[PDB]
Design a protein around this ligand. Sequence first.
Ligand SMILES: Nc1nc2c(ncn2[C@@H]2O[C@H](COP(=O)(O)OP(=O)(O)NP(=O)(O)O)[C@@H](O)[C@H]2O)c(=O)[nH]1
Ligand SMILES: Cc1nc([N+](=O)[O-])cn1Cc1ccc(F)cc1
Ligand SMILES: [Mg+2]
Ligand code: NA
Lengths: 469, 167, 166
Amino acid sequence: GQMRLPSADVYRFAEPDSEENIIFEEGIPIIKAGTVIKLIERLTYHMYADPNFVRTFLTTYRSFCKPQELLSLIIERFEIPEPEPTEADRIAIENGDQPLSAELKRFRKEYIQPVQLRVLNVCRHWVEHHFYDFERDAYLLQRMEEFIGTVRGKAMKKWVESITKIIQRKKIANITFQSSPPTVEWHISRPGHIETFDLLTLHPIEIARQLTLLESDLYRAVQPSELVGSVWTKEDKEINSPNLLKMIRHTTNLTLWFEKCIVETENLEERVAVVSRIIEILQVFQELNNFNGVLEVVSAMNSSPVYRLDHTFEQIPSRQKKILEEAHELSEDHYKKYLAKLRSINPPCVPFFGIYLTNILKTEEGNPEVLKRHGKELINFSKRRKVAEITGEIQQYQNQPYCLRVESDIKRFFENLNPMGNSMEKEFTDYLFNKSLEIEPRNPKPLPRFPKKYSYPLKSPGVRPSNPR
Amino acid sequence: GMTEYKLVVVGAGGVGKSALTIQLIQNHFVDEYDPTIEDSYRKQVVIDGETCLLDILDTAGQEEYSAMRDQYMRTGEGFLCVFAINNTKSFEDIHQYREQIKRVKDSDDVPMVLVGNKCDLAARTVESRQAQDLARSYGIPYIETSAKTRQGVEDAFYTLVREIRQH
Amino acid sequence: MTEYKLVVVGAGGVGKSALTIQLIQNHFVDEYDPTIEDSYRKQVVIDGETCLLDILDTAGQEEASAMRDQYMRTGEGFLCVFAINNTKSFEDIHQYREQIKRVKDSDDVPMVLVGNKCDLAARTVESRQAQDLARSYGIPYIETSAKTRQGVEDAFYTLVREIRQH
Ligand SMILES: Nc1nc2c(ncn2[C@@H]2O[C@H](COP(=O)(O)OP(=O)(O)NP(=O)(O)O)[C@@H](O)[C@H]2O)c(=O)[nH]1
Ligand SMILES: Cc1nc([N+](=O)[O-])cn1Cc1ccc(F)cc1
Ligand SMILES: [Mg+2]
Ligand code: NA
């Protein structure tokens, strides 16, 4: 038969499952809703491990339980009472013999040790992957150190000593490939001559590579703490979502730089060379699976200042028109083709983050925090699972590094790009649109001619890589 | 077959804008939502006896991607310009959203509606008369909606479709 | 995208976690932090087909030895890892093989035998002895180094191919 459990009066996690405290979805069960006590019981269940549940819970629990209260509850979970001797044990002891303690030994082996180990696994995952709770609350960290540091008994000893060391390392806190990265490519600008760096003087292959390294690093830096609770949309967004906002602001700045390069090139022939070069950069972004970069270019080409430049579009070579149109089609029909392409490529890649943000926000806004059942309020855990499915997808694409060499000067050039200067957004985007009207006036105004502005050759070196010995 | 209307929701972030489309598209009577499922933003409706399909673009959460606004807006035939009735800044933003729509669509007469959204019980700071006056100065309808009771939600979208039909 | 459930098993300290983290992050973990249970996901194209690997990294320490049935039920294929400088870990392989067969009630479970730490000169398990064992199981034998990446993709992606053909 099943093991007997402690009395629910001395140990709260032995209360029987009922529809008043846990609801399952329709081969381990999937929880739709439950009390916090039942969620923690299943987080640390004696019959099975649920590593996905541990990640989901630790990512999302702050919407229904404070960090200090979570720690209290898992310590309470850990402290399991042992059963009293059975009748057979009593009779053995009364005869001066050693009891078999069969039921006690089974309860230790099949209930206490698995539950206690799974509590420690929650602690380990909490410290390793969600350490911000402890960075923001020093007293929470003291309580965790004290709890782990006072666990006795040899069954847990290896993990207790390990978790103690992991905590200490996290308080004071390398990539291998088998292939070499390709050689850095140079065009008109030569190494070390940062003062000449520009859209047409750097090699378009190397522009796309260095922007991909930059955008990959920005993508990889975003933690779930910047996302759960929709905090990047709220008044404290600069405090709670700084890496996300840095990533978005880079994307916005690059798009505006592309627009500025285009509309400040008043000579039509030169402006065609500028647009063609940006489409070549887009082609390398596609080859690198840098979808953020792809959409940075597409957004610039569909901006109001650029979209209306019919005379420029007419002279773009047909093969480059097709590259741009295929990239644009990724976003059509609510990103249908983008989503399919992301799920088909071989990483590394740089996803477009905006879709994730909209889906997290709408999941949080469109589902209730609690479900009311039999007069009780149960935590709606299905809602939290949906959010954690999105953060898990984000994290899956954060693992794979690009096998590309950093060029520190080109990296710095793009880090310091500031197309808006000191201007405010409206002032700057009105400036870009007025430049568009200047260089290609609205019909029936005649098309003017403008002098050339570039003194170096406009011919592209192309986007096929070279390989000397 | 039936006409499809491509509608675009625009407005300040962080003040409950997404509740408008969620409440429309939702199973009205089950408070639940999965935005990831294909066609969680398409709804067949009957407006003035004529069946049509609404395709709604709501990029709520992407407000910081400001250089993508033009591309998103150009997909639309009609626009809901949404502010929160307890956030004066979101109301003051409306003028620039409307100007941007007109530029993107290259038209001085783009179908649009002004929507004042009640997203919580915090004190209202934009009175309905202020919003009615702004809407009249633009020549567009004004609809107020609740983010919690679904009041006004159908009216906002149906009024916009009527603006498209009567353009 | 087909999903594949891989499970990495073997004695404590043989490098199950280091192998998994090398595959997932291209990073070699120098620390020896004993695992309780960890899970990872990886999208990867194998033989032209995109799939999603769910990788369960399990506990090798003997104190966790009563908690294995639950993860063996869910796994579709198993990497059976020993370290080529630890004879005891090689002798432990047959216990994992027999438990997997019992739990899944099957003589035909996708598996790969992995001899890890092949960057180390001081080998105590000869390749021939491991290869003989693998042949008796009907499975391939792949020597790996989580430190250098030698053999790491080969081991995991060979297991995927065996699940695919199962
Ligand atoms: N030289 C070398 N050391 C390795 C290799 N793989 C793992 N190690 C080292 O061996 C130790 C144990 O590695 P680890 O991955 O934690 O082993 P494990 O099998 O996951 N242990 P457990 O079963 O307790 O979770 C670590 O110090 C790690 O750096 C390898 O291929 N080469
Ligand atoms: C016509 C067009 N198709 C797309 N598109 O995304 O497919 C964008 N554009 C606008 C445009 C692009 C380049 C240019 F030089 C002038 C205008
Ligand atoms: Mg391990
Ligand atoms: Na206000």
